[PDB]
Amino acid sequence: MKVILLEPLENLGDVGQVVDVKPGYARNYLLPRGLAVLATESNLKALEARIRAQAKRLAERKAEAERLKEILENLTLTIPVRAGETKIYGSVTAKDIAEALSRQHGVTIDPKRLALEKPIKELGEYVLTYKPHPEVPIQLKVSVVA
Amino acid sequence: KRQVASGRAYIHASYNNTIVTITDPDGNPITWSSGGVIGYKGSRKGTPYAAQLAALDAAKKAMAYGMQSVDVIVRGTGAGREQAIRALQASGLQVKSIVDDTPVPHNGCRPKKKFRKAS
Amino acid sequence: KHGKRYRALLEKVDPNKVYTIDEAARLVKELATAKFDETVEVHAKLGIDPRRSDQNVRGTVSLPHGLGKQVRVLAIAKGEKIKEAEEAGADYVGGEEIIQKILDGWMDFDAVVATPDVMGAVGSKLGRILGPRGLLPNPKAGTVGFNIGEIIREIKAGRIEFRNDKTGAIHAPVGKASFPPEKLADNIRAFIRALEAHKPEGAKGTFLRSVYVTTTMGPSVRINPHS
RNA sequence: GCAGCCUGGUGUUGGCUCUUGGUCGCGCCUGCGUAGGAUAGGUGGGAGCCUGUAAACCCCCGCCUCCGGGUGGGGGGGAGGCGCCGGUGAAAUACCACCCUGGCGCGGCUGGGGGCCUAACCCUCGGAUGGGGGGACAGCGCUUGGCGGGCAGUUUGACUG
RNA sequence: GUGAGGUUUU
RNA sequence: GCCCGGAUAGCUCAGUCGGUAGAGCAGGGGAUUGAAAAUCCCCGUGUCCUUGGUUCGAUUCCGAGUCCGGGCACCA
Ligand SMILES: [Mg+2]
Ligand SMILES: [Mg+2]
Ligand SMILES: [Mg+2]
Ligand SMILES: [Mg+2]
Ligand SMILES: [Mg+2]
Ligand SMILES: [Mg+2]
Ligand SMILES: [Mg+2]
Ligand SMILES: [Mg+2]
């Protein structure tokens, strides 16, 4: 199955190789998300037809995107939460925190992949895997909901 | 498996059977035997000769593991617990302390009517 | 067992050989450091199943070169034994009537002779020492000819056998430590195909699997099954 | 035979992880109802080799164990271990291993059973390109076998005061 | 702390 | 018909994981119990399916099936 990658999918090799994978995986997880493309003679012609004009766009959209650990979560900041509500009635998810960080502290996030699994009632530390060939994740520390 | 040396032990000394089982400090048994390994049926496995190949076999198949002590806990009383436990107390195995957990049955209402003829 | 002699030249075992014919058959002289009269004891394998009827392994074949091995039978003289000074007889003892059940024999057997052919009555009575290993005389041994003077003359410089029980631990006593491929030219030419001609009717499978020509003083080398 | 039901394979239908399975012997070292000296497998050579390129009463010791005990790394030993026979028996080793009996590393495909995520699919929410739950299961197609008067086509002979 | 396969009236 | 497990004494059964073997009845008299029942005791009944073979043997292991059963076909 001729599928071409655009970014490393944590397995299956490197970008642009002739890799075989299940159509149930590539058809539903890779194609509507915009990460792998079906490779005909056209899309199998495009990667050697553009070796700098799009690899420079991977250098921009990946090498320019791998520096967002600066002012987001590593520095100490009081994370804005809702009023207490001592016991958590509505659990925190990946969605319901970036509008708080958009009102206070002015930080804009996706807000996808702020909870890769188990949107949980409790609070603590968590890592944000932002994924250009995935690098070291930034660490958020939720300390209090008051 | 990992052999164990320190730890506690459990003791069953009821009317029909007297079998020990040496444990860890977490409560995991390491072996069990009986008098049925010879074939002692009914009440032929009490106090003075035939079946310390239950408890001494419980320390003898545990001799390959090499336990240090047997902290005594007696569940089920009577029927000659004394020499069956004291075979293991001072003829090959060390002991640390004698702190026994005697069972204290109340049950509220009656169990099977064997006891009620002598109450 | 892994001592001084095996650590010297263990490289010649070579468990990943490609094709060997002569260089794993003739090399028994100095790879087997022997200071005694050794037997090369050539192995083979007869592929059968020993747990069914109509299946009886038996094989006796001769070799007229001489083998460096004498007759050494325990001769018991009976009626119709002498041939009126036949110039090649009456060498061993002629009697003593051994009934040695007390102190259970002397356990050093090499060759057993039995002339009178009374096996229907002496069956499981003369073969007392050799039950499962079975060097007792048998009707299936093929040592019944026309005259009497054909058993000693063939055990002398002959009468080698292949017969196994439940496995294939088989042997071929032919040569000394220094026998040439001129003696392999009648050993591995006729014995490994004699155990292919002699065959029970229930033979089905590989039928020739583990044929090692290994010695008493040396390593285990392997040839192709036809050489 | 069919409707319908159960069920294997397969498409829709994916990502991981755990231990199990099969032709699986390259390797580990497994045989003590046993009658004598016994970690005694049947047997093949059976007077040579363990041996000073580091022995013996048994002290190294992983290895398994039916608890007796033997086989590999041998760091300090220093000419002594003792078997072919006697001894046991349905069989005589100590030198070279033929595969069964087995705890086990893996070469081929993971076959099955679990735990998590989930975008496919399904259900659901006020105004629904978005939330929640199930989740590769269900349903649906092909194929295979069984149940199946619920249904349909059927047969149930002739002589005979 | 311990004991009964257990009996029938001439 | 391929494969699956077995045929033990009028009755049925204790079996071997190769060196073993039978107990109960219509039966006669029997320590018993103070002459009562029989608790209990001798006791009338093995081609261990027909046959071939490792085997010291076969009262027991394995091969073809004649003896009876379940599944599975196949029957012009
Ligand atoms: Mg289906
Ligand atoms: Mg789930
Ligand atoms: Mg979705
Ligand atoms: Mg979901
Ligand atoms: Mg499905
Ligand atoms: Mg009808
Ligand atoms: Mg019609
Ligand atoms: Mg009375």
From Swiss-Prot, chain A:
Belongs to the bacterial ribosomal protein bL9 family. This is Large ribosomal subunit protein bL9. Keywords: Ribonucleoprotein, Ribosomal protein, RNA-binding, rRNA-binding. GO terms for cellular component: ribonucleoprotein complex; ribosome. Part of the 50S ribosomal subunit. Coiled coil: none annotated. GO terms for molecular function: rRNA binding; structural constituent of ribosome. InterPro entries: Ribosomal_bL9, Ribosomal_bL9/RNase_H1_N, Ribosomal_bL9_bac/chp, Ribosomal_bL9_C, Ribosomal_bL9_C_sf, Ribosomal_bL9_N, Ribosomal_bL9_N_sf.
Curated annotation (Swiss-Prot), chain B:
The keyword Zinc-finger does not apply. InterPro entries: Ribosomal_uS11, Ribosomal_uS11_bac-type, Ribosomal_uS11_CS, Ribosomal_uS11_sf. GO terms for molecular function: rRNA binding; structural constituent of ribosome. Residues 99-119 are annotated as: Disordered. Keywords: Ribonucleoprotein, Ribosomal protein, RNA-binding, rRNA-binding. Pfam families: Ribosomal_S11. It comes from the Bacteria. The keyword rRNA-binding applies. One of its GO terms (cellular component) is ribonucleoprotein complex. Residues 109-119 have a biased composition (Basic residues). GO terms for biological process: translation. Gene3D superfamilies: Ribosomal protein S11. Located on the upper part of the platform of the 30S subunit, where it bridges several disparate RNA helices of the 16S rRNA. Forms part of the Shine-Dalgarno cleft in the 70S ribosome, where it interacts both with the Shine-Dalgarno helix and mRNA. Part of the 30S ribosomal subunit. Interacts with proteins S7 and S18. Binds to the C-terminus of IF-3; however exactly how IF-3 interacts with the 30S subunit is unclear. May contact the C-terminus of Era. Belongs to the universal ribosomal protein uS11 family. This is Small ribosomal subunit protein uS11. It comes from Thermus thermophilus (strain ATCC 27634 / DSM 579 / HB8). The gene is rpsK.
Swiss-Prot record, chain C:
One of its GO terms (biological process) is translation. One of its GO terms (cellular component) is large ribosomal subunit. Keywords: Repressor, Ribonucleoprotein, Ribosomal protein, RNA-binding, rRNA-binding, Translation regulation, tRNA-binding. Coiled coil: none annotated. Disulfide bonds: none annotated. One of its GO terms (molecular function) is structural constituent of ribosome. It comes from the Bacteria. Part of the 50S ribosomal subunit. Belongs to the universal ribosomal protein uL1 family. NCBIfam families: rplA_bact. Directly binds to 23S rRNA. Forms what is known as the L1 stalk, which protrudes beyond the 70S ribosome surface. The stalk is preferentially stabilized in 70S versus 50S crystals. Interacts with the E site tRNA, blocking the exit path. This blockage implies that this section of the ribosome must be able to move to release the deacetylated tRNA. Protein L1 is also a translational repressor protein, it controls the translation of the L11 operon by binding to its mRNA. This is Large ribosomal subunit protein uL1. It comes from Thermus thermophilus (strain ATCC 27634 / DSM 579 / HB8).
